[PDB]
Design a protein around this ligand. Structure first.
Ligand code: DTP
Ligand code: MG
Ligand code: MG
Length: 510
DNA sequence: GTCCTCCCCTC
DNA sequence: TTGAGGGGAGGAC
């Protein structure tokens, strides 16, 4: 019989539990060369124009046209110009200190007179990118009932309902000119409509006729395994068809190309979306999970949450090798996560451990073992969270020279931050029909000696027309407080100043 | 009980 | 890098 149960299939129809099914169909979609594509589209340029988006002197995004020249993100604009004479460098929008609005200064930059965009007198605006991100999000949410915005240019989609409904109910989809999906799937549809199945019983064996169903995109398959051999493959393939449709809506409506990863889990999807770019969809079958994870590109540190100090501690505590760490984890504790838990409990129970400088929770070693056991097999299923309209907003200026050399300069930059945040808040209120209320503000700064000073606390609310004022009041309070705390110590000129609204109330309207 | 400060993760 | 942003522990209040 199938490896899968009626329970696992039917749970694809539940947004709260679909992710947990071995039959899950998740997509990760990442915008290609995002900031460069935004600038390309704003300036009416083409896929063939070698655009790079520039922030001060750094390339922050490189179009795929420009990458054909050898240009890489974080190249300096100087280096980029050597590699491509026809380069189209476009600087981010900016705010000018003393003004309360952002705009593009096209024709201006550190390349190029009276046309330089100085780091002393401006701050970056990323708002054109954020706007375009929210447009994309609207398109994704219209196509799919569960979408997680993972970062400015990434989303995850849970395709469970679309796949389930297509599998059971779609009477138009054609596999071939002589074969409809409804007829290929007559046995399973009969059983489902007949309703006479046990939720804990295994599914029938896939019908031979469903093997005509095609995947849309690149199926990762170096070992040449059979494409459709169980119901997970049927769902994944249907999912790839729908995902292509969604990605085409993004391309047709907004102009943006995407790369996409399709698999049963978020973690594998995120790896897969980065496998092939631009404008591509990489599909990882369950039976190809180990082939993919072990291709040589990935280590335990490639997994989300494991890319920093915890990951490095795990390499040391689990005596992981420098390469093929994923396979190592899998083969060293091959049967169950408890084997790994036992190993962890031993290392951590030792009196010479150091529990105050470790990122492993000794009380939660069952969860860590299960996470590593499953990640190493490509079967660690995390839920998608639908995020609120906004959670936090930051306005940040890293400062050069003496552009912030006294409390007067601090406040001058705070006025830019306050104007920016207020305009961002108004835009969200109009776009999403909400009242958006800052509740808590944090000021963070760095001295000339790079020492960090922070202060957070409540901000009062008196409506949108007084919002900038209410933010500034608290900011001025906090910067003057911190000035006192820095007396007789290395302080001015500052090397960084930022204001973040760290907590919002969101009121629904209509 | 919640708040503030400090910290870790990611693009 | 800079300029974002997500999240949580634990002592302060
Ligand atoms: N370290 C960073 N600092 C500031 N901005 C960044 C940084 N990394 C990425 N970005 C911005 C610019 C990118 O266009 C956007 C999305 O990031 P990312 O997906 O990593 O690259 P990308 O979309 O430019 O290229 P790709 O086609 O490889 O996805 O976020
Ligand atoms: Mg991208
Ligand atoms: Mg990204």
């Amino acid at each position: 019989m199938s490896k899968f149960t009626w329970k696992e299939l039917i749970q694809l129809g539940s947004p709260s539990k679909a992710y947990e099914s071995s039959l899950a169909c998740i997509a990760h979609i990442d915008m290609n060369a995002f900031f460069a594509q935004v600038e390309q589209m704003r300036c009416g340029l083409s896929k063939e124009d070698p655009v790079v988006c520039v922030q001060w002197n750094s390339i922050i995004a490189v179009s795929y046209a420009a990458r054909k020249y050898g240009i890489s993100r974080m190249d300096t604009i100087q280096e980029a110009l050597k590699k491509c004479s026809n380069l189209i460098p476009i600087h981010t929008a900016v705010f000018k200190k003393g003004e309360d609005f952002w705009q593009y200064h096209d024709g201006c930059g550190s390349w190029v007179p009276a046309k330089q965009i100085s780091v002393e007198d401006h701050k970056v605006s990323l708002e054109p990118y954020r706007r375009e991100s929210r447009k994309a999000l609207a398109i994704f949410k219209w196509a799919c009932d569960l979408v997680e915005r993972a970062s400015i240019d990434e989303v995850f989609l849970d395709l469970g309902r679309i796949c389930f409904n297509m599998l059971m109910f779609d009477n138009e989809y054609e596999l071939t000119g002589d074969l409809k999906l409804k007829d290929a799937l007559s046995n399973i549809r009969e059983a489902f409509i007949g309703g006479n199945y046990d939720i804990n019983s295994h599914l029938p064996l896939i019908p031979e006729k469903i093997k005509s169903l095609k995947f849309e995109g690149d199926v990762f398959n170096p070992e040449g395994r059979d494409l459709i051999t169980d119901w997970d493959d049927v769902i994944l393939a249907l999912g790839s068809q729908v995902c292509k449709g969604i990605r085409d809506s993004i391309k047709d409506i907004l102009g943006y190309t995407t790369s996409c990863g399709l698999s049963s889990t978020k973690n594998v999807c995120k790896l897969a979306s980065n496998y092939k770019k631009p404008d591509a969809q990489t599909i990882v079958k369950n039976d190809c999970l180990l082939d993919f994870l072990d291709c040589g590109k990935f280590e335990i540190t490639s997994f989300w949450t494991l890319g920093g100090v915890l990951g490095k501690e795990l390499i040391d505590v689990l005596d992981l090798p420098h390469e093929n760490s994923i396979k190592h984890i899998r083969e060293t504790w091959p049967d169950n996560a408890g084997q790994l838990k036992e190993f962890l409990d031993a290392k951590v129970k030792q009196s010479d451990y150091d529990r105050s400088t470790s990122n492993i929770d000794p009380l939660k070693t069952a969860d860590l073992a299960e996470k590593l056991f499953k990640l190493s097999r490509g079967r660690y299923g995390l839920p998608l969270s639908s995020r609120p309209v906004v959670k936090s907003m930051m306005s940040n200026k890293n400062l050069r020279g003496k552009s912030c050399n006294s409390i007067v300069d601090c406040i001058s930059w705070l006025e830019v931050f306050c104007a920016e945040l207020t305009s961002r808040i108004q835009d969200l209120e109009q776009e999403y029909n909400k009242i958006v209320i800052p509740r808590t503000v944090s000021i963070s700064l760095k001295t000339k000696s790079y020492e960090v000073y922070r202060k957070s606390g409540p901000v009062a609310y008196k409506g949108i027309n007084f919002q900038s004022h209410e933010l500034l009041k608290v900011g001025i309070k906090f910067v003057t407080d911190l000035d006192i705390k820095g007396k007789n110590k290395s302080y001015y000129p500052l090397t960084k100043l930022s204001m973040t609204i760290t907590n919002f109330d969101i009121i629904d309207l209509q």
